[PDB]
Each structure stands twice: as structure tokens, then as C-alpha cells.
């Protein structure tokens, strides 16, 4: 079996706790959490094996040492989070971006450009396209959330399908919070 004691801390970009939960699970079943309104360790929702969680309400709830820290609750996060918190809402790395042809997929068009976009934090990022200065739609419409790299950097891409004419200049626009200025990358058929 596996068991969890999950504490979530929810605080806005400044550093104030808007909510906080203390849940207890066993075998990927959510068993007992903290109810701030009634100030108790009540079992979460209902359950087929909740009786264990109901008994899990009695062991605990017999511990004022604990039972106080749950009353403390929200502010305990700010107390726990204040040292690093600033820098983490402050942590921000701009996204290197590059444009190159990729193998065309799902298209009658002969050329497909990928605008790769990597090494950034946070992951919120927006990528659009332009042809000769004006704004066109991108290839997919399904919103791809960026893929975590596991080392606090993220990455992603957008595609664009065109029939080439050398007079044209296609441009890819990246709006990370990392930069104050939109990053552009031009592409021309004779590049």
C-alpha cells in the first residue's frame, strides 16, 4: 500500500494564504481532511471503507498539539513560506526561440515552419504568427500547455503551414512574462 499526508498551501503572488487543506489518504483513496468551518478532523466526503477514516478521525482529534496547528492553519504557510516565497514569485527566465522548417503533417501545404520556444519560467507563454506584418492563425488550435523539463524550465512550439513565395516574410511572436518586449523571429523562403 501507499499512504499520504498531503498539505496544500495556496497563496497569491504577494504571499497571503487564501486557503489551506490537511488531507489524509491511504491506497490512493482520500480518507480524512481538515474542515475549517467546524474545526474538526472530519472524514472527507463519504466512503465504502470510510470507517477506517472515521476511526482515523478519533486517532487525531485526540491531539491538541496537532489540533492547534490546524487552527493555526493559514498563517502557518506565510510563516513557512516567507524566506523563499518572494524569489519564487520573482523567479523568471526568458525563452530562447528559433524558427526552422519541420516535416509537414496534416496539410496540403508544401512548407511547415516550427517556432520552437524553450528554457523558460514560468510556463505561461503565448506564441502567434505574422505574414508580411499582418496576423494569421497558427496550424493547430488545440492549446498545448508547455512541457516541464523537470529543472524549473519549460518548452513548447507552434506550427504554421504555407505555400512559399520569396517576397513574403513570416514572423513568429513570443510573449513570455520573462521579457517586457515581444521576441520576434523572421522567416523568408530564400533564407
Amino acid at each position: 500500500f501507499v499512504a499520504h499526508v498531503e498539505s496544500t498551501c495556496l497563496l497569491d503572488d504577494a504571499g497571503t494564504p487564501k486557503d489551506f487543506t490537511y488531507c489524509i489518504s491511504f491506497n490512493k483513496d482520500l480518507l480524512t481532511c481538515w474542515d475549517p468551518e467546524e474545526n474538526k478532523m472530519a472524514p472527507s466526503e463519504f466512503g465504502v471503507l470510510n470507517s477506517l477514516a472515521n476511526v482515523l478521525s478519533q486517532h487525531l482529534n485526540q491531539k491538541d498539539t496537532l489540533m492547534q496547528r490546524l487552527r493555526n492553519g493559514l498563517q502557518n504557510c506565510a510563516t513557512h513560506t516567507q524566506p523563499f516565497w518572494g524569489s519564487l514569485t520573482d523567479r523568471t527566465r526568458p525563452p530562447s526561440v528559433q524558427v526552422a522548417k519541420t516535416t509537414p503533417f496534416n496539410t496540403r501545404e508544401p512548407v511547415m515552419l516550427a517556432c520552437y520556444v524553450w528554457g523558460f519560467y514560468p510556463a505561461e507563454v503565448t506564441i502567434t504568427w505574422r505574414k508580411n506584418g499582418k496576423l494569421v492563425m497558427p496550424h493547430s488550435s488545440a492549446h498545448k500547455t508547455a512541457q516541464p523539463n523537470g529543472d524549473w524550465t519549460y518548452q513548447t512550439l507552434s506550427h504554421l503551414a504555407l505555400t512559399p513565395s520569396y517576397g513574403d516574410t513570416y514572423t513568429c511572436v513570443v510573449e513570455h512574462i520573462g521579457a517586457p518586449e515581444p521576441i520576434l523571429r523572421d522567416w523568408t523562403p530564400g533564407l
Binding site: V2, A3, V5, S7, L52, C77, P83, A100, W118, G150
Partner: protein, 189 residues
């Protein structure tokens, strides 16, 4: 009007290896994971925690540890055989950290999702040949009571390179395999 953020302190335990762990993660990237041999918080890469293992709260941790371990200890056998054990089969994919430029130094990321229970060993193979990878394997706790993990292989891309990432799920020696080949290489400048 201000965007919200989640810092999750996840205390976990299980039968087998490891017996106990503790991942804390801000925004689904972890900064810390605990060490119970050394009673200290080991850092991921957020410039390696200048604040680090502030000992400012062992009461919280050491309490959750013993209780978790009680649930595995005294609740385990009473329920063993009566309700089924929750398990997923882990999913592995490998992509490049940076864009693919032939002959230019890169890294291979092996992203393991759907890890439950969190016990695994990951091996890299280059043309089906066992090859050591940079760093250790980072297991992180994620929302919804599951786990993920990362591994990394530095290398220089050749047009012919074939790599594979192999995940062993330690609960019954199950394996997932994920292949990599160079695709859509950007022009070398």
C-alpha cells in the same frame, strides 16, 4: 485579481523501498525532497536553496512521518487481501531539452508519468547498449496522489543516433520502453 499559487508538502510512505519520503513542490516543480537518513531537506535546482534545510520545522515533518509509517505498519496487514492495491503502469517519453542541431551538445530528458507506487529504476541505452546517465532520478509528488520522475542523458546528436529510456516499475519488475531518434533537425549554421 492576483494569480494563485500552490506549494504542496507531500508526506508519503509504502511497503518496500523506499519506506518513506517527502516531496514539496511549488507550481508542480519541486524545490525540495526530504532525507530521513540525514533529517534534512535536500534541494532540487532552485539555485540549491541558500535558505536550504532550515531546521525551523521538524515537529510538523517528524509527526507526519511516524503516523504515515503507522498506517503502513498497523493498517497494512488488517486490510491486506480484503481491498485491492492501487497501482498504475508508468508512462515514459523522451524528448530533447534544447532544439536538435546535429553535432551540437544536448541532453535527453526521460519524463516518467503515472508512477504509482513510487518505486522505480531508470536505465538509458544508446543503440541498445547500457549507458550511464548524468545525475540521479528525481521523483516528485504531484496533485491527485500520483508521482512523476525525471532522468537525463547528455550526448552529442548524430543523424544515426538511436536512444532508448527504460523504466522498471519496482513493485513487480514491469518495464516501460521509450525510443528516441533525431527528427526535424534544424539547419547547422
Amino acid at each position: 485579481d492576483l494569480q494563485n499559487h500552490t506549494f504542496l508538502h507531500t508526506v508519503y510512505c509504502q511497503d518496500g523501498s523506499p519506506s518513506v519520503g517527502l516531496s514539496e513542490a511549488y507550481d508542480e516543480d519541486q524545490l525540495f525532497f526530504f532525507d530521513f537518513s540525514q533529517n534534512t531537506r535536500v534541494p532540487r535546482l532552485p539555485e540549491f536553496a541558500d535558505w536550504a534545510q532550515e531546521q525551523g520545522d521538524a515537529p510538523a515533518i517528524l509527526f507526519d512521518k511516524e503516523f504515515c509509517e503507522w498506517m503502513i505498519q498497523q493498517i497494512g496487514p488488517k486490510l491486506d487481501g480484503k481491498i485491492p492495491v492501487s497501482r498504475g503502469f508508468p508512462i515514459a517519453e523522451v524528448f530533447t531539452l534544447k532544439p536538435l542541431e546535429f553535432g551540437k551538445p544536448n541532453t535527453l530528458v526521460c519524463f516518467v508519468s503515472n508512477l504509482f507506487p513510487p518505486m522505480l529504476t531508470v536505465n538509458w541505452q544508446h543503440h541498445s547498449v547500457p549507458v550511464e546517465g548524468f545525475g540521479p532520478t528525481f521523483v516528485s509528488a504531484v496533485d491527485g496522489l500520483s508521482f512523476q520522475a525525471f532522468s537525463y542523458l547528455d550526448f552529442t546528436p548524430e543523424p544515426s543516433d538511436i536512444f532508448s529510456c527504460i523504466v522498471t516499475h519496482e513493485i513487480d519488475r514491469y518495464t516501460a520502453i521509450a525510443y528516441w531518434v533525431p527528427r526535424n533537425a534544424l539547419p547547422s549554421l
